Every structure is written in structure tokens, then in C-alpha cells.
């Protein structure tokens, strides 16, 4: 949604070779307009295609699309596909490669001055075959999340015309992604792990697919749980609600030791060293089209997280994620199976949901998140 | 900084002759290079002699680029003006006129199928000489304003290479635009509206231009000072704060008939009806372009405005505008003089302020304001 990604991977004897191959090839790129029209053909029934995919995909897809600043819908891009002609298309590519802002990442079997050569390379290569040249620091600019209002709840509701299952996501925005913030949510998330697996399939048996974790998108976090079911999405509402409360219950009347169990637990799993190279080669990339550039992430974390308490994170829910915190901000995505209308603990009462009729209308009336601040200042 | 602009002024008998004649004039246009280069030429020139400008000027000049979410500067526009070239320029125009979104306003001598016809004669213009298509609605979006953060001060210094002037202006960011907040603002501005001039022209000197009053941009308002001097914009700084600390102690000193009179005085001035048919049609499309749509503005706002108290102010002043308010929004510019370096009432100790060195940096740091919610629902 930033532009084009390009990645080489394997023996670095002949990586120069291909990479050229792949830059002057696509420098000087030369339309094959019977392939095209069947590239094309092949991505309109790719985006009607999308309509047979899994439920619990499509509130994932829609959740996306609602906290984002801007992203183009899968209706609205078919609607558009029409629109695009060959000329129209061989009018664009060196539009597109006219202003470029390349930032890379070498990762391996080479040196500094390889490493200069292989950049310095593709340049050379755009700036003649597309006369390339820099992008203003102004024009450099990254889309950022919807900010939510306190206690607040939005709901977005859709039909799956295919699966006779029902989906949801709900997503419980934290705050902006930081070492308190962050640790924070991934402990609560290490804790609530095994019990939301337990509570809400092994005994409850909603649906075979039952998830709970951290969400990171655009510098913003919080806490999602996703569940494909066949009960509607307002009765998995219910119970993950009643679920919470299970669970802030649990960490009061959990021993020390048992919290500090899961507390070493996190750390092992988040100082784990990576095996294969392009393993390592993840994480800084990571840490680089995210632009936070936190190299020494896990170290920093992992010393804060064993500094937390019982109490630190109990508070933490009640300011956070309680069903009557404060500064709770939900947003969840119902998606209905394609025939639908409209021994447990007993969930609380939830507050009137504000229905979602518009994305266009919903995002102008919330604020928009800050960018998260580069650990390296240029 | 949405697209185009088109007013036509004056006797309604041969205005379909006129409006024709420029929009399937602008639909056709053939460029003359002879005269291409000549307002090009004159275009960098333009460009280049705003450092001419009054100091005064700079300030508001800059401000607006401050907290205007997309906002492009006079470097970065001739800079790209080299790159400006006669077919770049016509490859541009069927691009800007292919897809369009038309909001007008017909005021005047006509009936309702008179200006249905004058449209839809507009469009079947564009549609013919154009090929002009609607845009889509996720298309429509307009930039927010920077939010500033609680109890903060952010300075941005440049210099006025021309005139042996300062220049400095003081944004006083208080909320998104509303009822209870703009005749709050309004008021405020109104019983300091004579005392500023008073005492910081009148009695104090600091320069021939002295300006106070409300600031209104992208949805979101505040107060607003703007003093051209020979004096250093720090100490201009420190006059004002000095000047807001009298007005307050002025305010829980006047009499209810003294608040009262100022309630009235506000009251009868945005009252006060169009005497003209364009000044009548400036309100209304300034409703429109700013897309909150209030026509009935001035009648709801001044009846809630008589409802007003004196602690109402106060409670706003400690609030939003005190020295050590808790929601007091403060970001300064400084333009200095072409040759500077770096009986009254005394100035309040004042916070230390951030410097802001990067624009683009500065704006990425902080959240987006809301859009304002139009008054009638589409």
C-alpha cells in the first residue's frame, strides 16, 4: 500500500545477476497485451473470489479496512478494473518509477562495500532506464489507525453469501505502541493464551477456530479475540465478555509464582533465537517497514516485563479492557453465516453498540493516531 | 487545495453565455507555449518574492503549514517548477478533468429548474469534452488540523531576510468547532477585543499592528494573537502573557451589566444581515465549502450564547487558555527581523518550549483532529 516490494533470496554467488535482471527488466518493461488481458481476467475473478473465502477472513479483512486512514475495498477495485486500458497502464509505469524513496535491507554472505555496490547498482539502472529521481521527505508520509473514542463501541456487520458459518473480531485498541504499553498487552495476552483456547472451545464449543493475541497495525496495538462459529456473533459477543471477567478473576486469586511462571514464560518465547538466516533477516525488516527501528526490541522488553506485578497489570485491565474501564475502545466486526437474521457464567451487560452504516463516515469522525517516533534520530 | 475554484458575478441575463464559454473553454483548452513560458517565468518570480512579504505575513504563512495536514511550501513548489514542462502540463489536464466532484451554489435571480438547468449544462460539458466521471465518496476526504498536546508550547523561529520587522503569532488551540466551544471562544475574544489593542498598542508601543481574535481551520478553532514590532518575538511573547493574566483578573472584576453588555455587543454583531447579494451568498457557501452546512448558524449560537455566565468564561479560561491551564494547546511563530540574533505588569514564568526543527517530523508526532459532523445527514 507503500508502493512495490522486492525480495532475493538464496546463494549469493549469482544474486547479482538476477537482481539486474529483475531491475532493467523492470526499468524497461515491454507489455505482452495478450497476456495482459488475461492477467487482468484473472485478477477480476481473483477479487470476485473473495467472496467465497473463510468468515472469520472476511472480519479480519473488514476490521483492516475500518481502523486504516485509507484502503481502497475489494468492490471498489473491480469497479475500477474496468478502467484500466493497456495505454492507460504503459502511461503509469514510469509515472510510478519517475519519483522513487528505495530503503533496503542486505542481509548475509557480503560486505560493506558489497553491500554499497548492490545499491548502487539498481540506482544506476532506474535513473537511466526510468530517470528516476528522489522523493521529498514531505511526500514520505504512512497512513496511521483510527483513533477510538472512550468507552466506545462500533460494530460493522456483513454476510459471508457462502460459509454456513458465522465470524467475528473484536478488537480492544489499547493505546499507541510502546516498552509499558507493549509488554503490557503481551503479558495480559500470555496469561488469557491458554484459558481462551480452554473456556471458549474445549468446554464452551463455539467453533473450531478460536484465536486471542496482540494486534499491531500502523504503530497502534490491542488485544482481538477472532471465533468462527455457528451461534450468531452477538452470542459470541456474550461469552468473551463473560470470559473476561473469568479471567481478571483468576489473576487476583493466582499465586505469585504462578504469575511469575507466566511472566518467565513470555520471556522465553520473545528471546528466542532465530535459526535460519532469512529468520533474522525477518525481524530487522520488521523493525525497518515499520520505521520504528528497535534493533535491541526483545532486550529491552523482556528486562522491562520482569519488572511487572500483579497489580500492574490488574490495573491495567481495569483502565484498559474492563467491561466498565474507563478507557475502553472496542470496535468489532460481525460477520453473518449465509442463512442468518437480524453451566456457563453469566456475561455482563453490554452497552448499546453504535452501528457502523458507513466506513467513509466513521473514519471522519474519530481522530487519527499518532505516527510512532523512530528509536534512531537521522 | 481541493481542485478548482469557479465564482461568476454580476447580472443573471447573460450568464449562461459567459459560463459556457468558460467551462467548454476549460474542457478544450489548446496551450499557447509562447504564453506558457511567459506565466511560467512569471510564476517563478511570484514564488520567489514572497520573501518580501510582510513579517506579519510569514507568521500566519507558516502556522498554516504547521497545522494543516498536507500542506506544500513555497521551496518545495519552485523547486518542482523546473519540472514543469509544456507536455507534462497538457498530459495533466485531461487527468485532473477525468474524474470530478461538482458542489455549487446558485444564489440569485433564477428558479429552481433554472438552476437544475444551468448544472446539468455544466456537466454534459465536462462529459462531452472531458469524458468526465463521478468520483467515488472514499475519494471526498479533506485534510484534518494537528491536535496539540495537553499543557504544551512549541516554537517555530525563522527569519525575514527584507524587512527590519518581527513578526510573531500565538495559536491558542482549544477544541473542535462547536456551539458551547465557538461562543465560548467568540465571547472571550470579544471582551478582549478593545484591551488588547489598548494595552499592547496604546499603552506598551509594540507595533503599528496589533491583532486579536478567533482561528478557524479544517473543523478545529482558537485564539489568536498577531503583533508586528521592533521588539524580539520572545519578549512579544512574554507582553501577551502578561496582557491575559489582566484580562482575567478584568473579567471576575467587571459588573454582570459590564458581561451583559459584551453578550449583546457579540450578539448584535453576528446579527447583523447581508446588504448585498454576494454577501449574502459569502455566508452560505462559507457553510458549505467548510461542509458543516449550518445555515440557521447565527440564530442557534447567539440564543445559546445569552444563556452564557461569567464563571462559564473563567471555567473556559482556567481550562483552556490560563498559563497553567490543563488543556492549554500553545504553538508560537517566530519570524525575526533581517538583522537578529538568537510601569508594566509582570510576565508569568513560561514553560520550556520544544523547537520544532522538522516540519514534516513535527506533524507525524501528533495526533489528526476529527472532521466536524455536517448538520444534515445525506
Redesign the interface.
Same mark, same amino acid.
Given at each position: 500500500i507503500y508502493g512495490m516490494y522486492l525480495s532475493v533470496k538464496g546463494y549469493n554467488d549469482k544474486q547479482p545477476i538476477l537482481l539486474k535482471k529483475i531491475i532493467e527488466k523492470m526499468a524497461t518493461f515491454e507489455i505482452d497485451e495478450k497476456r495482459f488481458e488475461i492477467i487482468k481476467e484473472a485478477y477480476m475473478r481473483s477479487l470476485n473470489n473473495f467472496r467465497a473465502e473463510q468468515p472469520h477472513q472476511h472480519a479480519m479483512y473488514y476490521l483492516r479496512l475500518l481502523m486504516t486512514e485509507?484502503a481502497?475495498?475489494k468492490d471498489?477495485l473491480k469497479e475500477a478494473l474496468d478502467d484500466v486500458t493497456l495505454p492507460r497502464l504503459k502511461?503509469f509505469i514510469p509515472q510510478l518509477l519517475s519519483r522513487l524513496h528505495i530503503e533496503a535491507l542486505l542481509h548475509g554472505n557480503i560486505t560493506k562495500q558489497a553491500a554499497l555496490g548492490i545499491m548502487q547498482m539498481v540506482e544506476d539502472t532506474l535513473i537511466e532506464h526510468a530517470h528516476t529521481k528522489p522523493l !521529498?521527505?514531505?511526500q514520505?508520509?504512512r497512513y496511521?489507525e483510527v483513533?477510538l473514542p472512550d468507552r466506545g463501541w462500533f460494530v460493522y456487520q456483513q454476510r459471508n453469501e457462502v460459509h454456513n458459518n458465522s465470524g467475528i473480531e473484536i478488537y480492544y485498541q489499547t493505546d499507541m505502541q510502546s516498552t509499558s504499553e507493549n509488554m503490557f498487552l503481551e503479558l495480559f495476552a500470555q496469561i488469557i493464551s491458554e484459558p481462551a483456547f480452554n473456556t471458549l472451545r474445549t468446554k464452551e464449543q463455539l467453533g473450531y477456530i478460536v484465536f486471542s493475541g496482540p494486534r499491531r497495525a500502523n504503530g497502534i496495538q490491542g488485544l482481538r479475540f477472532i471465533i468462527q462459529s455457528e451461534k450468531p456473533p452477538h452470542y459470541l459477543e456474550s461469552r468473551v465478555e463473560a470470559f473476561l471477567i473469568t479471567m481478571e478473576k483468576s489473576i487476583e486469586d493466582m499465586t505469585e509464582e504462578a504469575f511469575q511462571k507466566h511472566i518467565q514464560a513470555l520471556a522465553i518465547r520473545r528471546l528466542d533465537k532465530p535459526k535460519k538466516l532469512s529468520a533474522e533477516s525477518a525481524k530487522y525488516w520488521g523493525e525497518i517497514i515499520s520505521q520504528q527501528y528497535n534493533f535491541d526490541r526483545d532486550n529491552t522488553e523482556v528486562a522491562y516485563l520482569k519488572t511487572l506485578t500483579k497489580e500492574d497489570i490488574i490495573k491495567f485491565y481495569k483502565e484498559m479492557l474492563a467491561v466498565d474501564a474507563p478507557r475502553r475502545h472496542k470496535v468489532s466486526v460481525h460477520v453473518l453465516a449465509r442463512e442468518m437474521d437480524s453451566n456457563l457464567s453469566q456475561a455482563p451487560a453490554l452497552p448499546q453498540p453504535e452501528v457502523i452504516q458507513?466506513m467513509?463516515e466513521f473514519k471522519?469522525? !474519530?481522530? !487519527?493516531?499518532? !505516527?510512532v517516533?523512530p528509536h534512531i534520530n537521522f
Open positions: 485509507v481502497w475495498t471498489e502511461a !521529498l521527505p514531505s514520505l508520509v496511521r483513533q458507513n467513509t471522519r469522525g !474519530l481522530p !487519527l493516531f499518532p !505516527l517516533k
